[PDB]
Write a protein that binds this ligand. Structure first.
Ligand SMILES: Cc1ccc(-n2c(=O)c(-c3ccc4nn(C)cc4c3)cc3n[nH]c(C4CC4)c32)cn1
Ligand SMILES: Cc1ccc(-n2c(=O)c(-c3ccc4nn(C)cc4c3)cc3n[nH]c(C4CC4)c32)cn1
Ligand SMILES: C[S@@+](CC[C@H](N)C(=O)[O-])C[C@H]1O[C@@H](n2cnc3c(N)ncnc32)[C@H](O)[C@@H]1O
Ligand SMILES: C[S@@+](CC[C@H](N)C(=O)[O-])C[C@H]1O[C@@H](n2cnc3c(N)ncnc32)[C@H](O)[C@@H]1O
Lengths: 382, 382
């Protein structure tokens, strides 16, 4: 229909190999922060058959048992037997971690007042919010995340014991344009691929995915006779996890954020402390965007910020409201200037970013869930 | 001024550790394609002090010497001595490469007619084009790439022998809104950070970066008394490359594409053959977008496509012209349907994607350069 369009987003499960890496990187970050709130962490993880490798830079007063931290994260995910393709008890854990470069340390935080610490790198970051859901997230990505969460729930409760931890989902929604804002009309296509055991047949899996997963997550009002379902479209997914596909930290940055909506600056979140603005400034930009929507100034908004390594204040700030505010974008920038301080050394205080809650962010998206500090809107003064 | 806004993009040099990984992943892909045009390649690279690790899946009839291919790529980049922090002659090259999962192979390409091969994965991809430059790319990212290329040029020609291969640049441009299209007005801020030797002082570097790099790349009409320069803002960058920061393939996906403009689906390009739609469908979507702009239908356009693993046709196609076309987005979709076939098995033929030219794409962006097939517009019939 005229004034309508399609949009597709995807999500992945806790056992998707890239997501395994994000969760391990954040389990390492949390382990350091539990002992040293000022740990400087830049922990990349790589996963392939039988291997977790940690590579990066950590300067911290914590004493962390990497073998224990990695294996416990893999256990939580559900890879606990060679029949599943990966086992926390018996995999190889390799560590190539060095101290943070002293050249970065001197230029960013050494001998600097905390509020005046420099950005840990240059870069650009975006925040986005949309009133199409209560949580201010796109419906395409919320549904895709919930489909993966439902698969994990039915695997863990033994309802569908043939399920394995590696999964991917994708949701296409037809939207109506509404003066810059968007209104979901219907779900056009759903894809679900999930690793499974050798005994279950394709028809049993497809029936369960439709009746016990899709129907348990997606409201029936969005599904109709024309909705297309691609359930186990490859036909066979016994080999999975790192054995099926090498994973790396920071290779699901669009799943971690807005599912293609808004914009992205390229930075990965997991394995990084607050001084790395790829994470802290993106969380602050989401906080700003969500505050503008919950404050009734916008129905849909995009915020860009950027930084230079060693410099505290952002180099640029831009706001695009998609035509959904009566205030000009110059007025919105002034409101943001009066209400937020986007220096990393102030974001850490506002968003409590030395707290070890990062492993919780590393699956199912970093935004629109669980009332993390960046999800609690700031009451704006203007 | 009213109707203006700021936008920032970044780029990185050939020796940036993430970019080293993209180039090595693509050198491995090209090595396979030189002997086996139908090689199935999914090669991730990880780089840290003294180490290149290859992890992933390759099924190919080629006989490839990974030690030689990796070291030759590192040599080309310029890491040829321990004084520079990395040396192709003496680094460790580790290989954890297995065959492609037979479950993926059976679901995607085994016993399938080439035109009817399934997408190698699910996912979403975007194409973008803007008439603000002849090459139909955002000026922010074109300038950022050219600044890194200039640093490599002056390093290689011996003009600035203190330069090392690892660099990052960032450009903020103030734009004027023009009926959906954008017009660059001026450069607001430039950042340049580049690895250097122990002997050169900060003032000599900052003077050279302004006079020999910025002035040699950015037209003077964009620079004025208010332009902000952050040159070597960390103050010291002797440690660099993988020693300073662990790199991974597919961690510069926004540098590889549009610098934050348009949209991104999350997929990485390097190390993947044509059957991986993260690369082929994104190249085809750029080709569509550039064809719509060069054909005079749009001044600025975004194209989304999506796929399911094992299914040839895209699941969804969407076009947003930012208000820059007289044709409706329904009409543009019909023109695209009549002129393009976005099945991966047809994109391979149109864009010649079995040719080993991929290492050439892995630095300075995959788009807007060198008249690759996806940069030559298709003449549209309607
Ligand atoms: C990153 C991004 C995300 C979404 C879109 N997107 C859109 O935002 C609108 C839209 C929304 C609301 C509207 N209100 N009015 C009065 C006009 C509107 C147009 C239409 C549209 N079609 N395809 C796309 C993109 C997938 C290619 C679109 C654009 N860029
Ligand atoms: C991904 C993306 C990129 C750019 C923008 N972006 C824009 O596209 C326009 C714009 C361009 C042209 C226009 N013509 N007319 C009549 C109105 C226009 C508005 C203004 C604007 N301000 N901040 C941003 C984003 C950085 C936050 C903006 C939005 N999204
Ligand atoms: C298709 S793989 C990427 C391509 C792969 N590296 C190759 O060698 O072709 C990407 C993701 O798809 C999922 N996957 C793996 N095996 C699959 C299968 N047989 N069917 C469907 N999806 C699968 C996993 O979540 C995996 O991380
Ligand atoms: C700042 S590092 C990322 C943070 C780092 N992992 C850490 O431990 O803090 C990201 C990129 O910045 C660049 N870089 C490295 N050392 C730098 C320095 N001393 N000054 C400026 N940029 C530097 C390199 O291009 C590097 O890949």
């Amino acid at each position: 229909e005229e004034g309508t369009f399609l949009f597709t987003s995807e999500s992945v499960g806790e056992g998707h190999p890239d997501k395994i890496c994000d969760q391990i990187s954040d389990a390492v970050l949390d382990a350091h922060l539990q002992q040293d709130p000022d740990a400087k962490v830049a922990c990349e993880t790589v996963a392939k058959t039988g291997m977790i490798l940690l590579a990066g830079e950590i300067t911290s007063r914590a004493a962390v048992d990497y073998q224990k931290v990695v294996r416990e994260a893999v256990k939580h995910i559900g890879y606990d037997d060679s029949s599943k393709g990966f086992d926390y008890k018996t995999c190889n854990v390799l560590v190539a971690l060095e101290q943070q470069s002293p050249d970065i340390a001197q230029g960013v935080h050494l001998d600097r007042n905390e509020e005046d610490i420099g950005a840990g790198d240059q870069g650009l970051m975006f925040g986005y919010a949309t009133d199409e859901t209560e949580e201010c997230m796109p419906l395409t990505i919320v549904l895709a995340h919930k489909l993966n969460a439902k698969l994990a729930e039915l695997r863990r409760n033994g309802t569908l014991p043939w399920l394995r931890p590696d999964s991917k989902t994708q949701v296409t929604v037809q939207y109506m344009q509404d003066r810059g804002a968007v209104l979901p009309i219907r779900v056009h296509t759903i894809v679900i691929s999930v690793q499974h055991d050798e005994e279950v047949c394709l028809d049993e899996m497809r029936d369960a995915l439709k009746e016990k997963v899709i129907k348990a997550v997606v409201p029936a009002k969005y599904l109709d006779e024309d909705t297309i379902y691609h359930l186990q479209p490859s036909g066979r997914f016994v080999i999975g996890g790192p054995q099926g596909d090498a994973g790396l930290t920071g290779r699901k940055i669009i799943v971690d954020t807005y599912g293609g909506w808004g914009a992205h600056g390229g930075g990965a979140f997991s394995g990084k402390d607050y001084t790395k603005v790829d994470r802290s400034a993106a969380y602050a930009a989401r906080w700003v965007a969500k505050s503008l929507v919950k404050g009734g100034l916008c129905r849909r908004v995009l915020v860009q910020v950027s930084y230079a390594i060693g410099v505290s204040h952002p180099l640029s700030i831009s706001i695009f409201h998609y035509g959904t505010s009566q205030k000009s974008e110059r007025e919105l920038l002034e409101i943001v200037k009066k209400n937020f301080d986007l220096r990393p050394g102030v974001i850490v205080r506002d968003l409590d970013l030395k707290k070890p809650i990062y492993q919780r962010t590393a699956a199912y998206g970093h935004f629109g869930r669980d009332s993390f500090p960046w999800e609690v809107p700031k009451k704006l003064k203007y």
